Amino acid sequence: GETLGEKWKARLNQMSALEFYSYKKSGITEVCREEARRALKDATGGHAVSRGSAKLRWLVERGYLQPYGKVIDLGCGRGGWSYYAATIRKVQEVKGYTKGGPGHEEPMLVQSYGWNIVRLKSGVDVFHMAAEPCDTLLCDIGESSSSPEVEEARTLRVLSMVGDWLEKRPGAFCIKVLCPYTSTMMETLERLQRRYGGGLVRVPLSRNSTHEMYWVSGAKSNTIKSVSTTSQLLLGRMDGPRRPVKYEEDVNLGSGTRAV
Ligand SMILES: C[n+]1cn([C@@H]2O[C@H](COP(=O)(O)OP(=O)(O)O)[C@@H](O)[C@H]2O)c2nc(N)[nH]c(=O)c21
Ligand SMILES: C[S@@+](CC[C@H](N)C(=O)[O-])C[C@H]1O[C@@H](n2cnc3c(N)ncnc32)[C@H](O)[C@@H]1O
């Protein structure tokens, strides 16, 4: 039968443009980015290069993963996850890879704390990269589509690639799951959790217009329960008034080099 997430996606696509604009941020958590954006336009100051640092911070501060050692960041974009990881005491090296080029984000070079242990490489298609051993595996790849089947096909592609890296047995991981809400995806995620561990978490900084969840090494949740709970939350926010955004301070990543 049709899943709750599938019902959500269909209703999402039916919304008027004005309905959608309000729904997408209704009741979500958001970091204030005005200060960081203006500074990145005008390398110090501790500003995060994207709102991605705050998403990974949310997971790390709650114990959903504990980065350490050599960190590989697949789909690093501007570098928000890589620069956040470099501030963590147990992390020793961060290697980010991203496609870049026209139409896509290129790595930004900033001097937040630990910048000297970060290497971001653009021009790389991770689907044509040989997997390498690492201690912490991060991946934030998954482009939204109005078609749930396209989201499924894209997520299956990401997860097939990520499995090659997980075979090296990193002790910590955080993998974006763009589409967790179809029957095929739930079965796939259950099998992956049985093989590699971890569990799925919804980060409240995600907009209501995406069903993305993060498969993280420090969770133990049931696939069906965690996905359905997220679908119910997203469906419930489609009814009634616009709920206020919960704003928090953006992450300050400090400055300076690290001794290694
Ligand atoms: C611009 N837009 C996007 N969506 C839906 O919202 C999903 C995500 O839309 P997005 O958040 O604008 O893209 P992003 O995740 O890359 O930032 C899309 O795949 C569509 O299903 C939209 N849905 C409605 N009803 N109206 C819109 O204008 C609209
Ligand atoms: C959602 S962004 C991640 C944001 C990042 N975590 C941050 O905090 O700034 C994902 C990035 O993955 C990149 N990407 C998508 N497919 C890729 C591929 N096949 N190889 C390398 N990078 C890819 C995209 O270009 C995009 O910049």
CATH number at residue 158: 3.40.50.150
Determine the structural domain holding residue 164 and report its residue range: 1-260
User: Is residue 202 a known part of a binding site?
Assistant: no
Degrees to nearest 5, angle at CA 219 with 234 and 136 = 115
Return the SS3 of 199: strand
Which amino acid is located at 26 in the chain? S
* Breaks in the chain after residues, C-to-N cutoff 2.5 Å: 42
**Alpha-carbon gap, residue 10 to 24, rounded angstroms:** 15
Resolution of this entry, Å: 1.5
**Alpha-carbon gap, residue 178 to 212, rounded angstroms:** 4
Q: Is the CB of 175 under 6 A from ligand 2?
A: no
Tell me whether residue 140 is one of the annotated catalytic residues. Answer: yes
Q: Are 85 and 138 in contact (CB under 8 A)?
A: yes
Output the residue whose Cα is nearest ligand 1's atom 24.
Answer: 13
- Residue 116 φ/ψ, nearest 5 degrees: -75, -15
The alpha carbon dihedral of 150, 193, 224, 173 has a sign of: negative
Q: What is the 121 CA–ligand 2 centroid distance (Å)?
A: 12
Tell me whether residue 93 is one of the annotated catalytic residues. Answer: no
Which amino acid is located at 106 in the chain? E
> Which residues is 72 bridged to in the sheet?
95, 137
Pocket test of ligand 1: the residue of 12, 22, 30, 154 to mutate, having most ligand atoms within 8 Å of its CB, is 12
User: Is residue 147 a known part of a binding site?
Assistant: yes
User: Is residue 113 a known part of a binding site?
Assistant: no
Tell me whether residue 121 is one of the annotated catalytic residues. Answer: no
| Residue 172: both structure tokens together | 């910590």
For residue 210, the ligand closest to its alpha carbon is 1
Give 149's contacts (C-beta < 8 A, 6+ positions apart): none
Q: What is the 209 CA–ligand 1 centroid distance (Å)?
A: 6
Q: Are 159 and 188 in contact (CB under 8 A)?
A: yes
Count up the domains in the chain and report the number: 1
Query: Which of 234, 228, 241 shows the shortest CA–CA distance to 209?
Result: 234
Q: Are 83 and 48 in contact (CB under 8 A)?
A: yes
User: Is residue 104 a known part of a binding site?
Assistant: yes
Query: Which of 65, 80, 87, 85 shows the shortest CA–CA distance to 33?
Result: 80
Tell me whether residue 55 is one of the annotated catalytic residues. Answer: yes
Catalytic residue (one of 151, 152, 212, 250) = 212
DSSP letters, 68-112, are -EEEEEET-TTSHHHHHHTTSTTEEEEEEE---STTSPPPP----
